[PDB]
């Protein structure tokens, strides 16, 4: 085999904090954590998001099947942030106070 | 006010609409929606919600 | 010389030969070995103090971009970060080897001078942790 | 016109030194601000996190800021004295040109 595509990204990815999903509904994108408590989104350039907190678990998926877009769940060690991206709004913001490992 | 401090205008619009679902005609909620739509520079909806405030108050200085 | 003396005497007593051993020690030789050891300790400590800062420096470049706010005395550290990390992976082994070597050199110098210095052996450890070259040589030649 | 120009050149050298020091202080202040904002974001987070690297960068940047501030003060005073001597020089030069 052979890599069908290969893109070098300008940031250092965190080990287990990588997810992919359609955030516009009809456009898959790659979400990935980064040092300094940030998260970048590769759309096809790169869009940054300020968590200001050391991520410990990231994931994309359908949180409400009414619509189709994928929520972006950025679990901090002391938080949890579902976050619609096509609109700069969040689906919720809870504090678990135990952790998001 | 908090959701606007975090720079999330659409969360604030949804919260205002949920409030207007609880309080079906509150002028403060409608005027908040209008202020948001006018800060997003969408006068087409700011004026519609100010017109709703008018249909409710008719002495509103802001509207 | 010390290791040779120990092992050769041990073998001779393994065969009961009763050999005689004499030695002649130059006073500049220990200072020469110290001048040889010095650059390695200096390099290791410098690498340690660089890896102390590489982390915060990356933490800042992630935000600012590191072309407009940081003085290049740290931009160099940024460019060499990978080497600094991979060599700090081995830095502590070099530190422990060098410290044991300097300790044994002290012991054997003063053993050929005649006395045992096992009491003051830990007393030089904190000197090495400070590591002024001239103060180290003064420690060697004085006490 | 030859012992006059020396005072003008001295004055302009002091001015250029002051501008250079002001740019250096601008850079030091920007760096201090960036590091201080990093420390602030660290203070906002609830979870512990090692930061001694950051505050020992802040201390160095701050001592450099203090040094540069004192240097700018010194250059301002030197420039003022140079200006007061140049005033007398140009007084005398105008007097001589009028005579």
Closest chain C residue by Cα to residue A12: C62
Residue C10 tokens, joined: 């041990």
Q: How far apart are CA C138 and CA C33, in angstroms?
A: 14
Nearest residue on chain A to C63, judged by CA atoms?
A: A36
Resolution (A): 3.1
Select from C56, C62, C65, C85 the residue whose CB has the most chain A CBs within 10 Å, as the one to mutate to test that interface.
C62
Cα separation, D81 vs D78, in Å, equals 5
Interchain contact B18–A (C-beta under 8 A) = no
d(CA A72, CA A41): 10
Cβ-based contacts of B14 with chain A (< 8 Å): 89
HEC assignment per residue over chain D:
CCCCHHHHHHHHHHHHHHHHHHHHHHHHHHHHHHHHHHHHHHHHCCCCCCCHHHHHHHHHHHHHHHHHHHHHHHHHHHHHHHHHHHHHHHHHHHHHHHC
According to DSSP, the residues that pair with A81 across neighbouring strands are A74
d(CA B34, CA B47) in angstroms, rounded, equals 7
Question: Tokens at residue D90, please?
Answer: 């140009």
Using alpha carbons, list the distances in angstroms from residue C78 to C104, C125, D6. 38, 32, 45
Contact between C116 and C110 (Cβ < 8 Å) = yes
- Angle of the C2-15 helix axis to the C91-113 helix axis, nearest 10: 70
Helices C72-88, C27-64: inter-axial angle, 10-degree rounding: 110
Question: In chain D, which residues have their Cβ closer than 8 Å to the Cβ of A77?
Answer: 47
In chain C, what is the straight-line distance between the N-terminal and C-terminal CA atoms, in Å? 22
- Window C:77-106, CB contacts with D under 8 Å: none
Distance (Å, whole) CA D56 – CA C74: 14
Q: Exposed e or buried b for every residue in C85-117, given b needs 16+ CB within 10 A?
A: eebbeebeeebeebeeebeebbebbbeeeeeee
Q: Which of B8, B15, B17 to mutate to test the interface with A (most CBs of A within 10 A)?
A: B8
CA distance A43 to A27: 8
Across the interface, which of D34, D35, D53 has its CB nearest the CB of C52?
A: D53
Q: Do chains B and C touch (3 or more CB pairs under 8 A)?
A: no
Partner D, chain A 35-64, Cβ-Cβ below 8 Å: 37, 52-54
Chain A environment of B7 (Cβ under 8 Å): 88
- A-C Cβ pairs (cutoff 8 Å, strict): 9
Burial C42-66 (b: 16+ CB within 10 A, else e): eebeebeebbebbbbbbbbbbbeeb
Residues of A with Cβ-Cβ distance to D47 under 8 angstroms: 53-54, 77-78
* Pure H helices in chain A: none
- Kindly determine whether residue C59 and residue A11, on different chains, have CB atoms separated by under 8 Å: no
Q: What kind and span of H or E run contains A15?
A: strand A13-22
What are the angstrom distances between the C-alpha of D17 and each of A28, D9, D84, D87? 56, 12, 18, 20
CA D7 – CA D1 distance, rounded (Å): 10
Residue A49 sits at φ, ψ, to 5 deg, of -140, 135
* A80 near D CB under 8 A: no
The set of residues, in sequence order, having a beta carbon less than 8 Å from that of A19 and lying 6+ positions away, is A30, A31, A32, A58, A59, A60, A72
D44 part of contact set with chain A, CB < 8 Å:
yes
> What's the residue count for chain D?
99
Helix, strand, or coil here: A39? strand
Q: How was this structure determined?
A: cryo-EM
Please answer whether residues A43 and A29 qualify as being in contact, where contact means their C-beta atoms are separated by less than 8 angstroms: yes
- A55-61 vs A71-76, strand pairing mode: antiparallel
Q: Supply the DSSP symbol for A94.
A: B
Residue C59: list chain A partners with CB under 8 A: 35-36
Looking at chain B, which residue has its C-alpha nearest residue A87? B10
- Sequence-separated contacts (24+) of A89-93 with Cβ below 8 Å: A89/B8, A89/B10, A89/B11, A89/B14, A90/B8, A90/B11, A91/A63, A91/A64
- Chain D residues touching C53 at Cβ < 8 A: 53, 57
Across the beta sheet with A13-22, the strand order is: A13-22, A28-34, A38-42, A46-50
Q: DSSP of C19-86, one letter per residue?
A: --------HHHHHHHHHHHHHHHHHHHHHHHHHHHHHHHHHHHHHH-SSSSS-HHHHHHHHHHHHHHH
Collapsed DSSP state (helix, strand, coil) of residue A69:
coil
Reduced DSSP (H G I as helix, E B as strand, rest coil) percent helix, strand, coil of chain C, to 5: 80, 0, 20
Per-residue tokens: C128? 């090495």
Question: Residue D31: how many CB atoms within 10 A of its CB?
Answer: 23
Chain D positions in Cβ-Cβ contact with residue A37 (cut-off 8 Å): 41, 45
């Amino acid at each position: 085999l052979q890599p069908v595509f290969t893109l070098k990204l300008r940031h250092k990815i965190s080990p287990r904090m990588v997810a992919v999903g359609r955030y516009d509904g009809t456009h898959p994108c790659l979400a990935a954590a980064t040092q300094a408590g940030k998260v970048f989104i590769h759309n096809p350039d790169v869009s940054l998001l300020n968590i200001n907190q050391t991520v410990s678990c990231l994931t994309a998926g359908v949180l409400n099947p009414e619509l189709g877009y994928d929520a972006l769940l950025v679990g901090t060690q002391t938080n949890l942030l579902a976050y619609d991206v096509y609109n700069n709004s969040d689906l919720f913001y809870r504090e678990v106070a135990d952790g998001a490992s | 006010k908090v959701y606007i401090s975090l720079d999330q205008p659409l969360t604030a619009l949804n919260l205002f609409k949920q409030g207007l679902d609880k309080f079906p005609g509150e002028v403060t909620l409608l005027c908040g929606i209008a202020r948001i739509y006018e800060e997003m520079n969408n006068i087409s909806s700011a004026t519609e919600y100010y017109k709703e405030v008018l249909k409710q108050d008719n002495t509103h200085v802001e509207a | 010389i010390s290791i040779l003396k120990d092992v050769l005497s041990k073998e001779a007593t393994k065969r009961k030969i009763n050999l005689n051993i004499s030695y002649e020690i130059n006073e500049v030789s220990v200072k020469h070995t110290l001048k040889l050891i010095h650059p390695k300790l200096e390099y290791q400590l410098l690498l340690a103090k660089k890896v102390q800062l590489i982390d915060a420096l990356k933490e800042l470049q992630v935000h600012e971009g590191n072309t407009n706010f940081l003085i290049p005395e740290y931009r160099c550290i940024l460019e060499e970060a990978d080497h600094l990390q991979e060599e700090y992976k081995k830095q502590p082994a070099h530190l422990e080897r060098l410290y044991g070597m300097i300790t044994d050199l002290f012991i054997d110098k003063f053993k050929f001078k005649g006395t045992n210095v096992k009491t003051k052996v830990p007393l030089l450890l904190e000197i090495l942790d400070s590591y002024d070259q001239n103060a180290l040589i003064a420690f060697f030649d004085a006490a | 016109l030859e012992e006059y120009f020396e005072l003008i050149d001295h004055h302009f050298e002091l001015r250029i030194n002051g501008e250079k020091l002001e740019e250096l202080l601008s850079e030091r202040a920007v760096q201090f601000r960036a590091i201080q904002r990093r420390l602030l974001t660290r203070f906002k987070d609830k979870t512990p996190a090692p930061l001694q690297h950051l505050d020992t960068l802040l201390d160095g940047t701050y001592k450099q800021v203090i040094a540069l501030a004192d240097a700018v003060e010194e250059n301002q005073d030197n420039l003022f004295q140079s200006f007061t001597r140049l005033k007398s020089a140009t007084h005398l030069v105008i007097l001589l040109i009028g005579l």
